[PDB]
Design a protein around this nucleic acid. Structure first.
Ligand SMILES: [Mg+2]
Ligand SMILES: [Mg+2]
Ligand SMILES: [Mg+2]
Ligand SMILES: [Mg+2]
Ligand SMILES: [Mg+2]
Ligand SMILES: [Mg+2]
Ligand SMILES: [Mg+2]
Ligand SMILES: [Mg+2]
Ligand SMILES: [Mg+2]
Ligand SMILES: [Mg+2]
Ligand SMILES: [Mg+2]
Ligand SMILES: [Mg+2]
Ligand SMILES: [Mg+2]
Ligand SMILES: [Mg+2]
Ligand SMILES: [Mg+2]
Ligand SMILES: [Mg+2]
Ligand SMILES: [Mg+2]
Ligand SMILES: [Mg+2]
Ligand SMILES: [Mg+2]
Ligand SMILES: [Mg+2]
Ligand SMILES: [Mg+2]
Ligand SMILES: [Mg+2]
Ligand SMILES: [Mg+2]
Ligand SMILES: [Mg+2]
Ligand SMILES: [Mg+2]
Ligand SMILES: [Mg+2]
Ligand SMILES: [Mg+2]
Ligand SMILES: [Mg+2]
Ligand SMILES: [Mg+2]
Ligand SMILES: [Mg+2]
Ligand SMILES: [Mg+2]
Ligand SMILES: [Mg+2]
Ligand SMILES: [Mg+2]
Ligand SMILES: [Mg+2]
Ligand SMILES: [Mg+2]
Ligand SMILES: [Mg+2]
Ligand SMILES: [Mg+2]
Ligand SMILES: [Mg+2]
Ligand SMILES: [Mg+2]
Ligand SMILES: [Mg+2]
Ligand SMILES: [Mg+2]
Ligand SMILES: [Mg+2]
Ligand SMILES: [Mg+2]
Ligand SMILES: [Mg+2]
Ligand SMILES: [Mg+2]
Ligand SMILES: [Mg+2]
Ligand SMILES: [Mg+2]
Ligand SMILES: [Mg+2]
Ligand SMILES: [Mg+2]
Ligand SMILES: [Mg+2]
Ligand SMILES: [Mg+2]
Ligand SMILES: [Mg+2]
Ligand SMILES: [Mg+2]
Ligand SMILES: [Mg+2]
Ligand SMILES: [Mg+2]
Ligand SMILES: [Mg+2]
Ligand SMILES: [Mg+2]
Ligand SMILES: [Mg+2]
Ligand SMILES: [Mg+2]
Ligand SMILES: [Mg+2]
Ligand SMILES: [Mg+2]
Ligand SMILES: [Mg+2]
Ligand SMILES: [Mg+2]
Ligand SMILES: [Mg+2]
Ligand SMILES: [Mg+2]
Ligand SMILES: [Mg+2]
Ligand SMILES: [Mg+2]
Ligand SMILES: [Mg+2]
Ligand SMILES: [Mg+2]
Ligand SMILES: [Mg+2]
Ligand SMILES: [Mg+2]
Ligand SMILES: [Mg+2]
Ligand SMILES: [Mg+2]
Ligand SMILES: [Mg+2]
Ligand SMILES: [Mg+2]
Ligand SMILES: [Mg+2]
Ligand SMILES: [Mg+2]
Ligand SMILES: [Mg+2]
Ligand SMILES: [Mg+2]
Ligand SMILES: [Mg+2]
Ligand SMILES: [Mg+2]
Ligand SMILES: [Mg+2]
Ligand SMILES: [Mg+2]
Ligand SMILES: [Mg+2]
Ligand SMILES: [Mg+2]
Ligand SMILES: [Mg+2]
Ligand SMILES: [Mg+2]
Ligand SMILES: [Mg+2]
Ligand SMILES: [Mg+2]
Ligand SMILES: [Mg+2]
Ligand SMILES: [Mg+2]
Ligand SMILES: [Mg+2]
Ligand SMILES: [Mg+2]
Ligand SMILES: [Mg+2]
Lengths: 51, 193, 203, 148, 99
RNA sequence: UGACAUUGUGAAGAGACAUAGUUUCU
RNA sequence: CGGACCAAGGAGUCUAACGUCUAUGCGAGUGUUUGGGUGUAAAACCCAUACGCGUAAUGAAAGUGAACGUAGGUUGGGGCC
RNA sequence: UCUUUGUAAAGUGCCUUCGAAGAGUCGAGUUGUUUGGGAAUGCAGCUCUAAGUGGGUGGUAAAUUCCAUCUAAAGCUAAAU
RNA sequence: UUGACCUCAAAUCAGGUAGGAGUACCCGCUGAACUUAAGCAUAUCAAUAAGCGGAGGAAAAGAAACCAACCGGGAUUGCCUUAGUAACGGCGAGUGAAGCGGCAAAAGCUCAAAUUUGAAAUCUGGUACCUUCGGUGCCCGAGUUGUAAUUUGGAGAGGGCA
């Protein structure tokens, strides 16, 4: 009966994931994260819906 | 074990409680299991729709009578008035409550019209064979939602006959308070020889 | 019908006719064995209203159980413990003699299912009961959609689990605010209200 | 988490921060609320005056709900109207057409009068008013309509 | 009834257009029936009176419907079953050892 | 040790409606 | 007083309910996770009705229930003009 | 797909007469136990023991008058647990 | 003398059933003390452990002698809540439910008491055949001290009419 799961406020949760989306642009953070992206067209990387 | 300026707590842990701890580890389990259970009932139940038709009902007590709320079943009166029998209404996915009684006309017309619309929006396959596949609507509750009865209009003319409302309340309160006494003044007085 | 007359007569146990019978009957039962099989119901109107039937596979059994308090055994009265538990002598047992009566016959006739039982008589030592049982292997019952529920395995020794009428009584099983403690089944409900329930997302 | 806990920091010093004279024994004061009339009374009077003894009446089988009666002040009140609809009635305050507010529909039981509402006529349906609440409504040209 | 329409006071409540439903037999569970009049009446004269009922009609004829009630209250359970038991004894007396 | 229940049938004697016999005790 | 010697075990934990403090979300509100929806399936994503705490107090109770006034006067007040 | 089970069985409208409904039980005193249940929450023992416009319940004992609400002392029964 | 009836016996009589195990969970019985109260007897631990009887895949509960007091609700069970509250308590230590509301699942019924009385209409067993979880014929037997149809309070029954 140790606490295993954790409650996060639904709204704080969105803020977090919103922020995480926001920084998927920002070339530098992506590079800083691993992610070999020096040779890609642009950021964000939008691709054809045919994918 | 009394110290500091702390609120006095009441943590009832003096029986062998560690023996009776229920961790709902199977919470996700039992939801998966409940979803599958309904997906089987859906398929067993042919195009029939998982639930029965429930009536409108006014919730009891001074705290919940504002709201209206699905009741158990439709009373023998409403069923008849809506033109079918108890015995048969059951086989047509209509819940009937032999215990509920009708004292309010509004609710009564409400449920009898609720039964009209139910009948008009279903189809009952023949006993024969055919079984003209007609795909299940899954609820019925969703199909025939229960809505709160509208009680008035947004705006209207201010009528002030001039009587305090507050003082109407005090007076009505008082009249009840001295009702039995003022009756002891009518029995002792009509007794006067 | 003659049944309605018998029923009403039986509510007159202080009437000269009825206590002639009860005094002569109670003497006879005390000469037979404490458990003895009954020829026929001696209250056919009571039996038949508790579920009895006059067809092969319905048994009646008559049983004698002593009266009074349950003397806590306990050698020499010696209790060993606090004074609240020192009682030996006004302790009373939470089951009625009716339950004791059914239970002792139901063991005697293991192959029978005890359906119900009714009181018949009593003196200063003994209460006397007649117990109505059903043979769940007798085809007369195994057929018979009305009584064949008894043949299910969930009704073995229903008299030792408090499921006859008297069992449900002493088990306190009735709806209402007067029965909160014992109603879904006292130990069950105790255990419930004494369960600590923690969710994954603690509330 | 355990890595920030002060007992990690206490490792290596004899007593775990619990003193060499005074130790950390089992229950020195006794368990729980023991001795609130005796060795612990200084702490019960102050911090907890009023703790011992009885007051008022018993009430067998009280059902809260009987006493359900949330309160709302003129203070708010205009908030029970949606904000778009609100400005429509704030302007064009008249008899003939004045908003009806079913404050029981909003789940309130009584209207108190905490203070000052614009001079717009409002028709207030409610179960209970306070003398002031009801008077202050009228000064704006509204009425109270006792409901149930 | 008819509720006044306000939240306190005498007939306190919401005004609602009424209905008064159809009546339930389960409300008539105690009612007589000629079948039960006949049989109880025919039984009474077969088995007669009981020891405490004899002491009850002699107690009326020589002490009245108050000491009878008092002792009947202790004999049965209640003052109310005793009220009704005395009356039964009055009508045992009147209808029999009189007209 | 007392009361009530098991507990019934006679007879003599006391005891009341207040000196017809339903009832109660020796 | 314990300790001949060496290795390996070896003691402020977890839980229910709380006080202060702090960080964060939203704010007269707030809390998705009993449940439903959904899913790449104990995850993540979504959500209706309630409920809980907060928005009113005070009396044992029946009850009543917060603007004389720019929501007061006086004195000190950072800041600003 | 073969037997037609049937001169069978059931549903409904109106008029009339009825309308059976569980006892050593309900209940009451006392004793013990138990319960948050408090002039007594259940249960059991012994004594007393009903009624039929009756009976039970209506969380402060009693007397009177009303009102609300179910229908005990027999019974079966899937799921959610 | 012969044949019944009632009650009671006996068979290596025809066919069957019970025991014992296990027991996590379930229905009951029975029942402590350590402990807590800074001592201790009421209380607490605990209607817990140990002991005893009885079941199932679940058990039990269950179609209101219910909740209420409302504009009333409407079998049971379980969750969220009501609530560490109403209340109990050397009113100390401690204890402590229920109604309403949301939700999961949903489902309902049958006896007794009735004259079939122009027909015991009912049923176990044996036996032969068959299309063998069973049907038919026949024969013993059960059963009127009542086996079936009908009815179950929500009703319902006998008449009469459509
Ligand atoms: Mg958070
Ligand atoms: Mg301090
Ligand atoms: Mg706890
Ligand atoms: Mg302890
Ligand atoms: Mg588990
Ligand atoms: Mg599961
Ligand atoms: Mg469903
Ligand atoms: Mg209503
Ligand atoms: Mg309600
Ligand atoms: Mg077909
Ligand atoms: Mg009688
Ligand atoms: Mg026989
Ligand atoms: Mg000892
Ligand atoms: Mg003790
Ligand atoms: Mg004897
Ligand atoms: Mg309890
Ligand atoms: Mg239980
Ligand atoms: Mg129990
Ligand atoms: Mg969770
Ligand atoms: Mg937490
Ligand atoms: Mg760590
Ligand atoms: Mg560290
Ligand atoms: Mg340090
Ligand atoms: Mg260190
Ligand atoms: Mg320290
Ligand atoms: Mg120190
Ligand atoms: Mg030290
Ligand atoms: Mg020192
Ligand atoms: Mg010191
Ligand atoms: Mg002190
Ligand atoms: Mg206190
Ligand atoms: Mg008090
Ligand atoms: Mg009070
Ligand atoms: Mg005021
Ligand atoms: Mg003597
Ligand atoms: Mg004799
Ligand atoms: Mg030393
Ligand atoms: Mg040494
Ligand atoms: Mg250690
Ligand atoms: Mg810690
Ligand atoms: Mg913040
Ligand atoms: Mg608000
Ligand atoms: Mg989740
Ligand atoms: Mg996905
Ligand atoms: Mg999974
Ligand atoms: Mg989605
Ligand atoms: Mg919803
Ligand atoms: Mg809220
Ligand atoms: Mg609150
Ligand atoms: Mg506060
Ligand atoms: Mg405010
Ligand atoms: Mg105040
Ligand atoms: Mg208040
Ligand atoms: Mg006043
Ligand atoms: Mg003033
Ligand atoms: Mg003034
Ligand atoms: Mg001054
Ligand atoms: Mg009944
Ligand atoms: Mg006594
Ligand atoms: Mg006990
Ligand atoms: Mg009391
Ligand atoms: Mg008691
Ligand atoms: Mg009544
Ligand atoms: Mg009374
Ligand atoms: Mg009702
Ligand atoms: Mg049965
Ligand atoms: Mg059952
Ligand atoms: Mg043999
Ligand atoms: Mg066994
Ligand atoms: Mg066992
Ligand atoms: Mg014990
Ligand atoms: Mg002991
Ligand atoms: Mg211990
Ligand atoms: Mg203590
Ligand atoms: Mg101690
Ligand atoms: Mg100590
Ligand atoms: Mg000691
Ligand atoms: Mg304790
Ligand atoms: Mg105890
Ligand atoms: Mg325990
Ligand atoms: Mg055990
Ligand atoms: Mg099963
Ligand atoms: Mg098995
Ligand atoms: Mg299951
Ligand atoms: Mg019923
Ligand atoms: Mg319910
Ligand atoms: Mg409290
Ligand atoms: Mg306390
Ligand atoms: Mg306890
Ligand atoms: Mg508790
Ligand atoms: Mg609900
Ligand atoms: Mg069924
Ligand atoms: Mg018919
Ligand atoms: Mg029949």
């Amino acid at each position: 009966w140790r606490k295993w799961n954790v409650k996060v406020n639904h709204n704080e949760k969105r803020y977090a994931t919103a922020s995480a989306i926001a920084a998927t642009a920002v070339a530098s953070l992506v590079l800083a994260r691993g992610h070999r992206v020096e040779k890609i067209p642009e950021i964000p990387l939008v691709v054809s819906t045919d994918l | 074990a009394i110290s500091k300026n702390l609120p006095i707590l009441k943590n009832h842990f003096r029986k062998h409680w560690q023996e009776r701890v229920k961790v709902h580890f199977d919470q996700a389990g039992k939801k998966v299991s409940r979803r599958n259970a309904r997906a089987t009932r859906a398929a067993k139940i042919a195009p029939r729709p998982l639930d029965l038709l429930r009536p409108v009902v006014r919730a009891p007590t001074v705290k919940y009578n504002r709201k209206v709320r699905a009741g158990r079943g439709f009373t023998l009166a409403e069923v008849k008035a809506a033109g079918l029998t108890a015995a048969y209404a059951r086989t047509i996915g209509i819940a009937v409550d032999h215990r509920r009684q009708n004292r309010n006309q509004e609710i009564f017309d409400a449920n009898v019209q609720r039964l009209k619309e139910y009948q008009s929006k279903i189809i009952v396959f023949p006993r024969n064979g055919k079984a003209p596949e007609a795909e299940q609507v899954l609820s019925a509750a969703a199909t025939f939602p229960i809505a709160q009865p509208a009680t008035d209009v947004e705006a209207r003319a201010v009528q002030d006959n001039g009587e305090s409302a507050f003082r109407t309340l005090r007076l009505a309160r008082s009249e009840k308070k001295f009702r039995g006494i003022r009756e002891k003044r009518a029995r002792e007085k009509a007794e006067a020889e | 019908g003659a049944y309605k007359y018998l029923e009403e007569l039986q509510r007159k146990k202080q009437s000269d006719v009825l206590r002639f019978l009860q005094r002569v009957r109670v003497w006879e039962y005390r000469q037979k064995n404490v458990i003895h099989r009954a020829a026929r119901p001696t209250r056919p109107d009571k039996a038949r209203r508790l579920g009895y039937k006059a067809k092969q596979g319905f048994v009646i059994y008559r049983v004698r159980v002593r009266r009074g308090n349950r003397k806590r055994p306990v050698p020499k009265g010696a209790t060993y413990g606090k004074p609240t538990n020192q009682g030996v002598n006004e302790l009373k047992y939470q089951r009625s003699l009716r339950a004791t009566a059914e239970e002792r016959v139901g063991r005697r006739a293991a192959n029978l299912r005890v359906l119900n039982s009714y009181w018949v008589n009593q003196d200063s030592t003994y209460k006397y009961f007649e117990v109505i049982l059903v043979d769940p292997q007798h085809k007369a019952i195994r057929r018979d959609a009305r009584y064949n529920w008894i043949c299910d395995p969930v009704h073995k020794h229903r008299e030792a689990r408090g499921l006859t009428a008297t069992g449900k009584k002493s088990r306190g099983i009735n709806k209402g605010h007067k029965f909160n403690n014992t109603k879904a089944g006292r130990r069950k409900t105790w255990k419930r209200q004494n369960t600590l329930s923690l969710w994954r997302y603690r509330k | 988490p355990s890595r920030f806990t002060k007992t990690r920091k206490h490792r290596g010093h004899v007593s775990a921060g619990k003193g060499r004279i005074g130790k950390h024994r089992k229950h020195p004061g006794g368990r729980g609320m023991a001795g609130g009339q005796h060795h612990h009374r200084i702490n019960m009077d102050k911090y907890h005056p009023g703790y011992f003894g009885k007051v008022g009446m018993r009430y067998f089988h009280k059902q809260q709900a009987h006493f359900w009666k949330p309160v709302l002040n003129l203070d708010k009140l205009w908030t029970l109207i949606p904000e778009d609809k609100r400005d429509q009635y704030l302007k064009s305050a008249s008899k003939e057409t004045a908003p009806v507010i079913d404050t029981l529909a909003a789940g309130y039981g009584k209207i108190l009068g905490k203070g000052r509402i614009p001079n717009v006529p409002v028709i207030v349906k409610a179960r209970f008013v306070s003398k002031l609440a009801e008077e202050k409504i009228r000064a704006a040209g509204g009425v109270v309509e006792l409901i149930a | 009834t008819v509720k006044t329409g306000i939240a306190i006071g005498l007939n306190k409540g919401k005004k609602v257009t009424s209905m008064t439903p159809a009546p339930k037999i389960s409300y008539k569970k105690g009612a007589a029936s000629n079948r039960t009049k006949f049989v109880r009446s025919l039984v009474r004269e077969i088995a007669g009176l009981s020891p405490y009922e004899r002491r009850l009609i002699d107690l009326i004829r020589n002490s009245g419907e108050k000491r009878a009630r008092k002792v009947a209250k202790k004999r049965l359970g209640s003052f109310t079953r005793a009220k009704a038991k005395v009356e039964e004894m009055n009508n045992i007396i009147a209808a029999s050892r009189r007209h």
